[PDB]
């Protein structure tokens, strides 16, 4: 099927583009129900939890805002008291009450402070010439609760430190760490940091056994008694950041509640609107046009007509660049130009590539017809992931049912690539049986490919080239091709469909548009097409053409300008080619 401009258009229409936006801030965790409800449960039940989602989601910001709205009982006073001259314990009094104990001591009624006072009793009994409570923390409300985010999870920062006054030390030289500051509230840490600092095991011992040891230096140490830990820990990390941790059975035991963010949200008015409010809260001066463009780029970042990328910090970062281009103002234009400027800043490799193509240093065709040749479409695996066309040739000779992927034999093709070739072979053997095993050897080469290549998305291109070589069928070089194929010859979905399409358009444009150039792609990828303005208008101008297909044969018909049947059709020519190949092989 041909995809009209109408079918291809996916952009949000803009009305009153320069009108300022005025909208209330959405609540934290908007469009992230799962994560919020998981977090809600964790709060309600006092469970430890971990927030998991890709980078740049705004997980930290969402977390701190959510915990900002919370209410707890005012935290107890927290102190170290000595139980000896070489021992100290961690103790809670009700709040503000340590200063009465401290001052009573400052002389020389508090039920909780018993053991400290018992051992507080023989200077007079031996003239024997360090003893006053060390306050760690105290606060005047549990609203908001204690919220301590320690991004750098070293032992001292988690557990506090011993200072040494020359060396001697005592209770008053013990400083607290994040763990102490988070009592009665929330401690937030990064999973990656716990690993990189090697403090995971000591962190388990604090949670599981209440061991919280101030960091020493390797003269003499105070023993420090364990105490019952009162805090809720929330870990933050990417899915990969948590896999080091999930292998330790201790992790799932300790952190029962997963709070997982979706990498995308439904592309809805309610999320567009929520995005506007969030941008306004961030301090941007936003126009309707600017909001609409950012909302659409978010859909395009997701490669989904019906979803939008949830990475609020990526969207904010693009908005920041747009703002500078609009002189402080976030307009449609400012956003289009900021998107275009990022592309330009990373365009050197494509400009080099296009120059090479224009010079013939890379040999590519975008017009005419040729047998056993097709433009397939690849993606360069370096950000920002430019698509490019790659010329693929198929050559058929009489031989013993062999399909040779030259790139995979040479060691450039990966496993999934190899699998795609074997799948085609399964198709061809089982499809053409009248001569027993296939009477041809077919060799496939990505012609000027000097690098490793991986994936199944060349399946369709390879199969149609093979069929062309088999039947001597001239194929259009003005349509590039992408798609995977299964063993039954159906065409399956591929990745990076926008980059692939846009990359062929870019070479066609650089060589001068013919007016008949285009791309053939999987019907299954229709939901992924979020093509850039310039390709859309070229399709609207009749200057470029997209075909969606469901089978390999459908693709071959478009390429060889004919139907499989109505014999004189392509199928009899393919059969005729095989008959010829079989005769040369046997007689």
């Amino acid at each position: 099927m041909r995809l009209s401009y109408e079918a291809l258009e996916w952009r949000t229409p803009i009305e009153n583009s320069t009108e300022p936006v005025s909208l209330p801030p959405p609540p934290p965790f908007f469009g992230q129900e799962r994560a919020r409800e998981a977090l809600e449960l964790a709060i309600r039940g006092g469970f430890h939890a971990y927030l998991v989602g890709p980078p740049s989601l705004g997980k930290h910001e969402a977390l701190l805002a959510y915990l900002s709205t919370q209410s707890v009982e005012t935290p107890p006073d927290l102190l170290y008291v000595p139980l000896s001259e070489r021992k100290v314990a961690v103790l809670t009094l009700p709040s503000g009450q340590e200063i009465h104990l401290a001052e009573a001591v400052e002389g020389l009624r508090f039920p909780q402070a018993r053991a400290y006072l018992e051992a507080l009793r023989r200077y007079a009994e031996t003239g024997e010439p360090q003893w006053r409570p060390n306050l760690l923390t105290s606060s005047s409300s549990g609203t908001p609760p204690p919220i301590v985010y320690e991004p750098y999870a070293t032992a001292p920062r988690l557990f506090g430190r011993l200072d040494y006054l020359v060396w001697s030390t005592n209770v008053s030289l013990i400083r607290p760490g994040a763990v102490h500051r988070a009592q009665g509230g929330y401690l937030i840490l990064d999973a990656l940091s716990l690993k990189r600092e090697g403090t995971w095991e000591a962190f388990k011992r604090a949670l599981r056994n209440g061991q919280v040891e101030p960091v020493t230096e390797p003269p003499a140490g105070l023993e420090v008694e364990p105490f019952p830990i009162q805090m809720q820990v929330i870990l933050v990390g990417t899915p990969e950041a948590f896999e080091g941790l999930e292998e330790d059975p201790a992790f799932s035991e300790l952190f029962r509640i997963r709070a997982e963010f979706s990498p995308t949200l439904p592309a809805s008015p309610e999320n567009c609107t929520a995005l506007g409010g969030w941008l306004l809260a961030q301090g941007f001066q936003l126009t309707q046009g600017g909001l609409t463009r950012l909302y659409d780029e978010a859909r395009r970042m997701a490669e989904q007509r019906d979803r939008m990328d949830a990475r609020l910090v990526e969207i904010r970062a693009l908005a920041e660049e747009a703002a500078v281009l609009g002189g402080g103002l976030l307009t449609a234009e400012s956003v289009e130009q900021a998107i275009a400027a990022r592309e330009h800043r990373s365009f050197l490799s494509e400009e080099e590539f296009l120059r090479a193509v224009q010079e013939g240093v890379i040999r590519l065709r975008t017009t005419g017809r040729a047998v056993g040749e097709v433009n397939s479409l690849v993606v360069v695996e370096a950000a920002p992931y430019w698509g490019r066309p790659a010329r693929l040739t198929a050559r058929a000779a009489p031989g013993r049912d062999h399909l040779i992927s030259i790139d995979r034999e040479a060691g450039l093709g990966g496993q999934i690539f190899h699998k795609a070739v074997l799948t085609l072979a399964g198709y061809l053997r089982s499809r053409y049986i009248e001569h027993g095993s296939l009477p041809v050897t077919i060799s496939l080469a990505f012609e000027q490919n000097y690098v490793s290549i991986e994936g199944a998305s060349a399946g369709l291109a390879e199969l149609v080239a093979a069929l062309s070589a088999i039947g001597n069928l001239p194929l259009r070089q003005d349509l590039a091709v992408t798609g995977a194929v299964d063993q039954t010859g159906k065409v399956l979905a591929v990745g990076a469909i926008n980059a692939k399409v846009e990359g062929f358009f870019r070479v066609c444009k650089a060589l001068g548009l013919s007016g008949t150039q285009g791309v053939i792609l999987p019907e299954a990828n229709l939901a992924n097409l979020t093509l850039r303005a310039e390709v859309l208008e070229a399709v609207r101008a009749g200057q470029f053409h997209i075909y969606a297909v469901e089978t390999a044969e459908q693709a071959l018909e478009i390429l060889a300008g004919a139907r499989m049947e109505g014999f004189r059709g392509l199928q009899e020519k393919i059969r005729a080619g095989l008959e010829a190949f079989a005769r040369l092989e046997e007689g």
């Binding site: 993606v379 695996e381 370096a382």
Partner: peptide
Amino acid sequence: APEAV
């Protein structure tokens, strides 16, 4: 860089 299809 390595390439994906």
